[PDB]
Amino acid sequence: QPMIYICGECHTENEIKSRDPIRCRECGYRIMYKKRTKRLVVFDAR
Amino acid sequence: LDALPRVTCPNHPDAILVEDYRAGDMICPECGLVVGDRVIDVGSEWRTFSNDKATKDPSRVGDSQNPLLSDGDLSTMIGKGTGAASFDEFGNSKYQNRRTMSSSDRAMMNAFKEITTMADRINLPRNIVDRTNNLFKQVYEQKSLKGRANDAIASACLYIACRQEGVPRTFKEICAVSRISKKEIGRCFKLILKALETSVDLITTGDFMSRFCSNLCLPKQVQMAATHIARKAVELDLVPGRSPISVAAAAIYMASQASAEKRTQKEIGDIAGVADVTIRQSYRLIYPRAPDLFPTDFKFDTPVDKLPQL
Amino acid sequence: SYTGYNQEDSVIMNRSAVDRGFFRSVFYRSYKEQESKKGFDQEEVFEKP
Amino acid sequence: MIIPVRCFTCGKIVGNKWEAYLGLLQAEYTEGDALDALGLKRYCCRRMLLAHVDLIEKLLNYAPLEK
Ligand SMILES: [Zn+2]
Ligand SMILES: [Zn+2]
Ligand SMILES: [Zn+2]
């Protein structure tokens, strides 16, 4: 299963999902930012 | 009471003994079970230095010393300053002189000092320095190559650490920040490889194409093309009798002359370190297939039908 | 003065106003963690314990 | 960060009257008249809008709404 990993500015998935070093293909940045969970939460409008 | 490793449950042999940190208690799930003389790990506990001046830490009854580089820690130090009484009674030496401690290893520490100097002179990461220091201690402890120049051994360790982390430096580069000869670093390199019975990956064009194109202020797109030029060149097996560094240099030149930047052979020579005659020969060898080597998405400035010859 | 729940350096504050978001705030704490190599023969690893 | 739905003190909805207000001030330099036309009688409802600062506008300007 993928661990996505949107990167800064390029606005695309890094896609890295393994032990290999973090660095976004095409885009020269090396900061990542793990993507939101698909798992549902909930918020009360109170 | 010697029979434990966490076991003393009265009615039944242990299966698990969970640590309920907040209660200060040891619990045994399938029954009820406390048994504990609790320690959340004495290292968090003594850490009651906080609101009081912590920048200086008066509480530090425990220095780190960093033993995993060394082995034998000895004693504290002393030094001058109350104004005096502290005899010299007649001569000019208050109290007494300090004393050396670890001399057999002082040149190991002296090696660690040289590795960091070398390391900073080419802006290496601490992670490389930490691998380098580690390799060295391993080579030192085996005492298999004690005869060799200690500085040559440190320099070779630095080269290995750099290649293992997947960002190799050339033998030419490590020699530059050192006083040891290229031949001797290379020789020590092989011997260390024999000493640790270990191996490293084989360098590729890609591992150096980045740094060079970068230091020449070349555009990102041109760097990309050169990479592709390099990769394909190796794929078409156009250079069976050539080193990958020289081929990398020749790709950089071809790219640069195919763009508006056009770095001179002497300049490329100057960053790469190889002789500019070596590039010229390598270029002459790849020139017959230049059309096929460029990326189809590359924005051409001067077409290959107008690419110069030298 | 009212019902004295405001005596001496306290205040009676309007609850429906705090419902309609009066002075509400957000709080952020950033925790940071490092993967230290830490020398000779040990290693830290980011993984599922 | 954008004008709140309903004034704190009482409840009268007030976010709806923000866009209208910037238009009135552009038309006329009559803050008194502007607040009046919008119907913000009592001053609690008035302080709400009169004292707001729309930080959102500067905040939106960063390119990375992507992180
Ligand atoms: Zn990126
Ligand atoms: Zn039990
Ligand atoms: Zn109101």
D/B touch flag: 3 or more CB pairs below 8 Å = no
Residue B18 pairs in a beta bridge with B27
Residue B20 pairs in a beta bridge with B25
A 10 A CB-CB count for B248 gives 31
What method was applied to determine this entry?
Answer: cryo-EM
CA distances (Å), origin D66, targets A11, A33, A38: 6, 11, 18
Can you tell me the distance from the alpha carbon of B21 to that of B292, in angstroms, rounded to the nearest whole number? 67
Which entry of C8, C9, C19, C43 is annotated as an active-site residue?
C9
Respond yes or no: is residue C9 known to be catalytic.
yes
* Contact yes or no for B68 and C40 at CB 8 A: yes
A 10 A CB-CB count for B175 gives 20
Domains contained in chain A, CATH given: 1-46 (2.20.28.30)
Structure-block tokens of residue B246: 């020289």
* Contact yes or no for D9 and C17 at CB 8 A: yes
Q: Token match 């010229």: residue?
A: B280
* Gyration radius from chain B CA atoms: 30
Q: Chain B neighbours among C 6-45 (CB < 8 Å)?
A: 37-42
Alpha helix (H) ranges present in chain B?
42-45, 106-121, 126-142, 150-164, 171-176, 182-195, 206-215, 220-235, 244-257, 265-272, 276-286, 290-293
CA distances (Å), origin B290, targets B205, B234, B240, B252, B294: 17, 13, 17, 13, 7
A 10 A CB-CB count for B35 gives 17
- The neighbourhood of ligand 3, an ion, using CB within 5 A, equals D 7, 9-10, 12, 44-45
Q: Which helix (H) or strand (E) holds D23?
A: helix D18-27
Can you tell me the distance from the alpha carbon of B248 to that of B213, in angstroms, rounded to the nearest whole number? 10
Is residue B27 helix, strand or coil? strand
The verdict on B127 touching C (C-beta cutoff 8 Å) is: yes
Q: What is the DSSP letter of B207?
A: H
Question: At CB < 8 A and 24+ separation, what contacts does B76-80 make?
Answer: none
Can you tell me the distance from the alpha carbon of B238 to that of B222, in angstroms, rounded to the nearest whole number? 21
> D42 CA to middle of ligand 3, Å?
7
Match domain D1-67 to its CATH number in 1.10.10.10, 3.30.70.980, 1.10.3300.10, 1.10.10.60: 1.10.10.60
Residue C22 pairs in a beta bridge with none
Can you tell me the distance from the alpha carbon of B218 to that of B260, in angstroms, rounded to the nearest whole number? 10
Q: What is the DSSP letter of B303?
A: -
CA distances (Å), origin D6, targets C17, C22, D17, D51: 10, 11, 11, 15
**What residue in B sits closest to C35 (Cα-Cα)?**
B127
Ligand number with the minimum distance to the CA of B18? 2
The verdict on C22 touching D (C-beta cutoff 8 Å) is: yes
The string over B40-65, giving b where at least 16 C-beta atoms fall within 10 Å of a residue's C-beta and e elsewhere, is eeeeeeeeeeeeeeeeeeeeeeeeee
Q: What is the dihedral of CA B122, B137, B185, B126, to 10 degrees?
A: -10
Can you tell me the distance from the alpha carbon of B48 to that of B62, in angstroms, rounded to the nearest whole number? 13
Q: What angle do CA D3, D6, D9 make, to 5 degrees?
A: 105
The verdict on C13 touching D (C-beta cutoff 8 Å) is: no
Considering only CB atoms, which chain D residues are within 8 Å of C20? 4-8, 11
Structure-block tokens of residue A24: 């976004």
Q: Which amino acid is at B203?
A: I
